[PDB]
Design a binder for this molecule. Structure first.
Ligand SMILES: Nc1nc2c(ncn2[C@@H]2O[C@H](COP(=O)(O)OP(=O)(O)OP(=O)(O)O)[C@@H](O)[C@H]2O)c(=O)[nH]1
Ligand SMILES: Nc1nc2c(ncn2[C@@H]2O[C@H](COP(=O)(O)OP(=O)(O)OP(=O)(O)O)[C@@H](O)[C@H]2O)c(=O)[nH]1
Ligand SMILES: Nc1nc2c(ncn2[C@@H]2O[C@H](COP(=O)(O)OP(=O)(O)OP(O)(O)=S)[C@@H](O)[C@H]2O)c(=O)[nH]1
Lengths: 422, 426, 422
C-alpha cells in the first residue's frame, strides 16, 4: 500500500481531473456518492463503504468549480478539496503567478501536505493544466516549484495542454508558454503532449466523429492517464513505477518532454470491423498521424520507446512485434541509445464508459516516447515569440503586474538553448 | 458575479441602451415587467451580471440613465419595458448642452457629475464584484460626448484596475449634422486616448448602407440600427453571460485586442444578416459566414480595411458545430487574405465560441477586428479640425464655457501623434 | 555578566525605544513599575525587586517625551533618562546638527558615559532614529561620531527609519538622508532597513490588517530587535555576539548596510492555519515580497546570509534547509564569498503581546543579509537629490544654519562613490 496525488489547475485542469476521477470511479464501480485494495492508490478508507478522490481542484475563476459542484458527483467529491477563485488571470502568466496566485498558494500547498500526511506511500504527484490558460500556466508553475522545495526528490508528473501551432485560444499564448516553460523547466520531472487539433483530426478520421466535443478530449486524457496508472492500480507481469518513467527518459535533466499516444481509438461499429493483434496495433500507433501530436517524429531521431500493454497480451508476441518494429527503417534511434526499450504488461483490460466514443476492448497499448520532433514545435513557438515580441506587444499587461522586459528575454534565450541542445 | 453597470448618455445612447435591455430580456427570458419565464436554466443562471436581486421573484437591469433633458427620458420610460427600471436610475438635467462638448462637460456637467458618480458607486457597492463597465453615447452630439468623457475620467480615477469598453457613435463623415461636432469628436477622442482602456467605433453611414443593401430595406430607421447594436451587445457579452466550451469575457478580448495603450480602437462586427427570402435559400453554414466576416459591405465603421492592414481579429460563435472547422476556416482566411492581413502578427485570429445561440437564430457571429483603416477616419477628422479652426469659427461658444487655444492645440497634437503611430504600424 | 545601551532620538526613535522596552519588560515579566540574571543586559539591580531601562530618550521636541512620561510606565522609566527639547529641527539635518544639537549633546554624551560606567560588560550601543526626521538625522549623526571618538572601537548598532522611495513625510528628506549618510558613513558599524510602505503592505497582505497603526510598526522593530538580542539575553546552541555581526558583514568598511527581515508575520487565526517548519518558513522569508525592504534582492548579488533561529529548532534541520536553499538558482552569491553563512540558535521562543498583531509561537527565524538591491535605492535617492538640488531648492534653509552649498555637493559625490563601489 501506496497512494498518489492529482493536481488540477485552470478550466482544462479541472475538467481533466473530473474526467480522470470519472474513469477511476466507473472502473472500480464507485457510485456518485462513494460506495459499492488497489483502489486505495486514489481513494481513502474512512467509515463504511466510503471513498473520496485524493485531489485538489483550484482555479482563479469559480465557473468550472461551480460546474463540478453542480454535477451528480457532489457527494463523490469532498466539498473542501474544491477551491474557488475570484480574479481569473485571463491567459496572463504573470497575473496568475503573482497577483492572485501568491495569496492562494498557501491553503493548497498546505492541505495537499495533509494529503501526503495520510498517504505514507505517496508514489508521486499528478499535475493537469494548460499552457494557454494564464491560471494553468502561472499557478501551476508556482505550485510546481513549491512542490519541489517542499518535497525534494519526490516524483512529479505533469499533464499540460500545450496550445497547438495553429490552435490558440489567446494570442498572448506564446508569452505564457515561454514563461512557464522557462520557470518550471528545472523542476518538471516529466511533461507530456496535448495537441487539440490533432485530437480533433484523429477523432474525425479514426473514430469518424464528425461533431466531437471536449468530452472526447476528456477521456482522451482519461484513457492516457488510465493506461499510465494501470501498473500502480493493477498488478501485471512487469509493473512499472513512476520513478522508472523518469529514470528511462531523463538521462539528462534538460530533455524531459516525451510525447504520448494511445492505441487504438476505434468506435464500436468499427470495433466490429477490427480486432487487435499486437503487430498491427503497435505499427498503427507508431504511425505519425495516429500520434495525437502535430509533429512528424520521422523528422528527427527517437530517444526511447516504452510500451504499456494492458489485458491479455503475450510477452513473447510483444518481443516479436517490437523486434520487427525495430528492423524496419521508418524507425531510427540515436547512436548512443541502442537499447532504450521498456515494456510494462498489465492484466487489467481497459475500461469503457457508457455512451463514450471508445469501444469496450479486453486489450490496449500505450505509446510512450520522446521524439526529436518536439524540437520543431519548440522552434516554431520561439520564432512566433520573437516575431510577436520584436515590436514588444502585450508586454505592458505583464508590466502592470510589475516587471520589466528582461526576464522575458532571458526566458527566450533559455528556451533557445533548450532547443539547440538537441 | 462579474457585474457590469450600464451608463447611457445622449438620446441615441438612451435608445440604444433601452433596446439592449429588451434584447437581454428576450435572451434571458424576462418579460416586460421583470418576471422570469425562460425555458432553460442557462438564461437565469447568470442573470445577476445585468440584473439585480429584486424582491418578489423579479429582476431589474443594472442600468444608469443620464441626460441633460427629460424629453427622451419620458419617451423611454413610457415606451416598451419602461417599468423594468426603477425611477431612481433616471437622473436628468433641465438645460441641455445643445450639442456642445464644453457646456455638457463643465457648465451643466458640474451639477450632474455628483449624481452620476453617486449612482455608479451605488451600483458598484450593491453588487458582488464589478467586472467592468459599458457606456453608450454619440461623439457627434455635444452633451453625450461630455458625459462620456467625464464618466471615463471619473471611473479611471476611481477604478483604475476595472477595465471597460465604450460604444461611442462617431459622427458620419458624409453628413455634417452638427457644425460644432468636430470639436465634440476632438475632445472626446482626446479624453478617450487617456481615460478608456478600449473603444469600439460605430459609424452611422456604414450601418445605414447595411440596412439599405444587405438587409434590403427601402425605409431604414433608428430601430434597425438599435437592433444591430443590440446584436453586437449580445455577441460580445454572451461568452460571459452564457456557458461556453471556450469561455471568454471582456477581459480576454481586451487582452487580445490592445497591443499598445493608445492603440485601442476597433470596429465591431455582426453576421449573418439576411432577409426572409434569402435566409430560406442561403446556406446556414460556417462558410456563408466566413465570406461575410471579411467584407466592405457588412462593415461597421466607415473606413475600408483593405486600404490598411488588420491588426488582429476576434471571432465569437454561438451554435452547434465543431471547432476544427472554425480553425481551418481561420487558416484559410489567413491564406487568402494574407495581403490584407499583417505579416508580423501570426495567427492573429482570436477564436472563441459561446454554446448558447441568440433567441431566434441558431448562429450569430460577432466580428471583433482591428485595422489601420480608422487611420483614414482620424486623419480626415484632424484635417477638418484644422480647416475650420484656422478660420476660428464657432469658437465663441466654447470659449464662453472656460475654454482655451492651446488646449485644442495639444488635442489636435494628440490625434496627430495617434494617426502617426497608426501609420507607423501600417 | 554584561550590558548594552539603547539610544533613541526623534519621534520615531523614542517610539521605537518605548516599544522595545515594552517587549523587554513583558518578556521578563516586568510590571509597569519595575518588579515581579540575563535580564541585566538591559536593566540594573538596585534596592529591592527593581529594574530600569539602560536608555536615553532625547528629542528636539518634547511632544513624544511628554507622551512617554504620561503612560502607565512612568514608574518603569527613570525621569532623568528622558530629555525634552525646545526647538525641533523640523526635518532639517543642519538645524538639529548645529543649532540645537550642539548645546544639548553634552548632557546626553555625558550621562550615557555613566551608563557605561556602571556597565563594565558593555557589549555595544543600540541607536534608533529616522533619516527623514531632522533631529533623528542630525543629532543621531553627531552623537554617533561622539560615541566613536569617546569609545574608539566599541561596537555600535544603528536602527534607522529610511524614508521609502514613494513615502516621504518631508520633501527635504533627500537633503537630510544624504547629509547624515555621508556624515556617519565612516563610523556606522552596521545600519539596517526600515521601509514604512513595505511594512504596511506586508501587514495588509500577510497579517491581513486592512487598518494597521504605527503600533504594528513599533513591534515590527520590537520583534526584529528581540530576535537580534535573544542571543545576548538568552543562551542557545550557538549564541552570536554583536562583534561577530559586524565581523561577518563588514569585510570592507564601505559596505555595512544590511537589510533585515522577520519570519513569520502571521495572525492568530492564520496561525491556526499554518504551523512552522524550517524549510517553508525560511523559503517564505527569502521571498522578496516577504522582505520588509522595497528592493528586490534578485536584481543584484547576495553578500552573506545569517540565520537567527529562536526556540525548538533542530540544527540538523537548519543545515538541511539551508543547503536546499543554496542549491536553487533563485539565490545567487558573489564569486569571492562562497561560504558566508552564520547560524545562531536560541532556545527562547519569541514573546507575544496581549492584543498584538503577531501570534504567540514557540519558534521563529530572523532573516539577516546585505543584498546588492540596496544599491538601487541608493541610486534612486541620489538621482532624486540631483534632480531637486539641480535648481538648488530648500538650500537656503541649510544656509541660514550657516554653510554654503559645497559640503552638499561632496556628500553627493561621496555617496555616488559608495554607490559605484558595488
Ligand atoms: N484538450 C482540452 N483543452 C481544454 C479544454 N478546456 C479548456 N482547455 C484549454 O484551455 C484553454 C483556454 O483557456 P483556459 O485554460 O480555460 O484559461 P482559464 O481557465 O480561463 O484561466 P485564465 O486564462 O488564467 O483565466 C484552451 O487553449 C485549451 O487548450 C478541454 O476540455 N480539452
Ligand atoms: N516606522 C515608523 N516610522 C516613524 C514612526 N513615527 C515616526 N516615524 C518616522 O518619522 C518621520 C517623521 O518625522 P520625525 O522623525 O518624527 O521628525 P521629528 O520627530 O519631528 O524631528 P524633526 O524633524 O527634527 O523636527 C517619518 O518619515 C517616519 O519615517 C513610527 O511609528 N514608525
Ligand atoms: N443609430 C442611431 N443613431 C442615432 C439615434 N438617435 C440619434 N442618432 C444619431 O446621433 C446623432 C446626434 O447625437 P445626439 O445624442 O442626439 O446629440 P446630443 O448632444 O445628445 O443632442 P442634445 O441632447 O444636446 S439636443 C445624430 O447624428 C443621429 O444620427 C438612434 O436612435 N440610433
Amino acid at each position: 500500500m501506496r497512494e498518489c496525488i492529482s493536481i488540477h489547475v485552470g478550466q482544462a485542469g479541472v475538467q481533466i481531473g473530473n474526467a480522470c476521477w470519472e474513469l477511476y470511479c466507473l472502473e472500480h464501480g464507485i457510485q456518485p456518492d462513494g460506495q459499492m485494495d488497489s483502489f486505495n492508490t486514489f481513494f481513502s478508507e474512512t467509515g463504511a463503504g466510503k471513498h473520496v478522490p485524493r485531489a485538489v481542484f483550484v482555479d482563479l475563476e469559480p465557473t468550472v468549480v461551480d460546474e463540478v459542484r453542480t454535477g451528480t458527483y457532489r457527494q463523490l467529491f469532498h466539498p473542501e478539496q474544491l477551491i474557488t477563485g475570484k480574479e481569473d488571470a485571463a491567459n496572463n502568466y504573470a497575473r496568475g503567478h503573482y497577483t492572485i496566485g501568491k495569496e492562494i498558494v498557501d491553503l493548497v500547498l498546505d492541505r495537499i501536505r495533509k494529503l501526503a500526511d495520510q498517504c505514507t506511500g505517496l508514489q508521486g504527484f499528478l499535475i493537469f493544466h494548460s499552457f494557454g490558460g494564464g491560471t494553468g500556466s502561472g499557478f501551476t508553475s508556482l505550485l510546481m516549484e513549491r512542490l519541489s522545495v517542499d518535497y525534494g526528490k519526490k516524483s512529479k508528473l505533469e499533464f499540460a495542454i500545450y496550445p497547438a501551432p495553429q490552435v490558440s485560444t489567446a494570442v498572448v499564448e506564446p508569452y505564457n508558454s515561454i514563461l512557464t516553460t522557462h520557470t518550471t523547466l528545472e523542476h518538471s520531472d516529466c511533461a507530456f503532449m496535448v495537441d487539440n487539433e490533432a485530437i480533433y483530426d484523429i477523432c474525425r478520421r479514426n473514430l469518424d466523429i464528425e461533431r466531437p466535443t471536449y468530452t472526447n478530449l476528456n477521456r482522451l486524457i482519461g484513457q492516457i492517464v488510465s493506461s499510465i496508472t494501470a501498473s500502480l492500480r493493477f498488478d501485471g507481469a512487469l509493473n512499472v513505477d513512476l520513478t522508472e518513467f523518469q529514470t528511462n527518459l531523463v538521462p539528462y535533466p534538460r530533455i524531459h518532454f516525451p510525447l504520448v499516444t494511445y492505441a487504438p481509438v476505434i468506435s464500436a461499429e468499427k470495433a466490429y470491423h477490427e480486432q487487435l493483434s499486437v503487430a498491427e496495433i503497435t505499427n498503427a500507433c507508431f504511425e505519425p498521424a495516429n500520434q495525437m501530436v502535430k509533429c512528424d517524429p520521422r523528422h528527427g531521431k527517437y530517444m526511447a520507446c516504452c510500451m504499456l500493454y494492458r489485458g491479455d497480451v503475450v510477452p513473447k508476441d510483444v518481443n516479436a512485434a517490437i523486434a520487427t518494429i525495430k528492423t524496419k527503417r521508418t524507425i531510427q534511434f540515436v547512436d548512443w541509445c541502442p537499447t532504450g526499450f521498456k515494456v510494462g504488461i498489465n492484466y487489467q483490460p481497459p475500461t469503457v464508459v457508457p455512451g463514450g466514443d471508445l469501444a469496450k476492448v479486453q486489450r490496449a497499448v500505450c505509446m510512450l516516447s520522446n521524439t526529436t520532433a518536439i524540437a520543431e514545435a519548440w522552434a516554431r513557438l520561439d520564432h512566433k515569440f520573437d516575431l510577436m515580441y520584436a515590436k514588444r506587444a502585450f508586454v505592458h499587461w505583464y508590466v502592470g503586474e510589475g516587471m520589466e522586459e528582461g526576464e522575458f528575454s532571458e526566458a527566450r534565450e533559455d528556451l533557445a538553448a533548450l532547443e539547440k541542445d538537441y | 458575479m462579474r457585474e457590469i453597470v450600464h451608463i447611457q448618455a445622449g438620446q441615441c445612447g438612451n435608445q440604444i441602451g433601452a433596446k439592449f435591455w429588451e434584447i437581454i430580456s428576450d435572451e434571458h427570458g424576462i418579460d416586460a415587467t421583470g418576471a422570469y419565464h425562460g425555458d432553460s436554466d442557462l438564461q437565469l443562471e447568470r442573470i445577476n451580471v445585468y440584473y439585480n436581486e429584486a424582491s418578489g421573484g423579479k429582476y431589474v437591469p443594472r442600468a444608469v440613465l443620464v441626460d441633460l433633458e427629460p424629453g427622451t427620458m419620458d419617451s423611454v420610460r413610457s415606451g416598451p419595458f419602461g417599468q423594468i427600471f426603477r425611477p431612481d436610475n433616471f437622473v436628468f438635467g433641465q438645460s441641455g448642452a445643445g450639442n456642445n462638448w464644453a457646456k455638457g462637460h463643465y457648465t451643466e456637467g458640474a451639477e450632474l457629475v455628483d449624481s452620476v458618480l453617486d449612482v455608479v458607486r451605488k451600483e458598484a457597492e450593491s453588487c458582488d464584484c464589478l467586472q467592468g463597465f459599458q457606456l453608450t453615447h454619440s461623439l457627434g452630439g455635444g452633451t453625450g460626448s461630455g458625459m462620456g468623457t467625464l464618466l471615463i475620467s471619473k471611473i479611471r480615477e476611481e477604478y483604475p484596475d476595472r477595465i471597460m469598453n465604450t460604444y461611442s457613435v462617431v459622427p458620419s463623415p458624409k453628413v455634417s449634422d452638427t457644425v460644432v461636432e468636430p470639436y465634440n469628436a476632438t475632445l472626446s477622442v482626446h479624453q478617450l486616448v487617456e481615460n478608456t482602456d478600449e473603444t469600439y467605433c460605430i459609424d452611422n453611414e456604414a450601418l445605414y448602407d447595411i440596412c439599405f443593401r444587405t438587409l434590403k430595406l427601402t425605409t431604414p430607421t433608428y430601430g434597425d440600427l438599435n437592433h444591430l447594436v443590440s446584436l453586437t451587445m449580445s455577441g460580445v457579452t454572451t461568452c460571459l453571460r452564457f456557458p461556453g466550451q471556450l469561455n471568454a469575457d471582456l477581459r480576454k478580448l481586451a487582452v487580445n485586442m490592445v497591443p499598445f495603450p493608445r492603440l485601442h480602437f476597433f470596429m465591431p462586427g455582426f453576421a449573418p444578416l439576411t432577409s426572409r427570402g434569402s435566409q430560406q435559400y442561403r446556406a446556414l453554414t460556417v462558410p456563408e459566414l466566413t465570406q461575410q466576416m471579411f467584407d466592405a459591405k457588412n462593415m461597421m465603421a466607415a473606413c475600408d480595411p483593405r486600404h490598411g492592414r488588420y491588426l488582429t481579429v476576434a471571432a465569437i460563435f454561438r451554435g452547434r458545430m465543431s471547432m476544427k472547422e472554425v480553425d481551418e476556416q481561420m487558416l484559410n482566411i489567413q491564406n487568402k487574405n494574407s495581403s490584407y492581413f499583417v505579416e508580423w502578427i501570426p495567427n492573429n485570429v482570436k477564436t472563441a465560441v459561446c454554446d448558447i445561440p441568440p433567441r431566434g437564430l441558431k448562429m450569430s457571429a460577432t466580428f471583433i477586428g482591428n485595422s489601420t483603416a480608422i487611420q483614414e477616419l482620424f486623419k480626415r477628422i484632424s484635417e477638418q479640425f484644422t480647416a475650420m479652426f484656422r478660420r476660428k469659427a464657432f469658437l465663441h461658444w466654447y470659449t464662453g464655457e472656460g475654454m482655451d487655444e492651446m488646449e485644442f492645440t495639444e488635442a489636435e497634437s494628440n490625434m496627430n501623434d495617434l494617426v502617426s503611430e497608426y501609420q507607423q504600424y501600417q
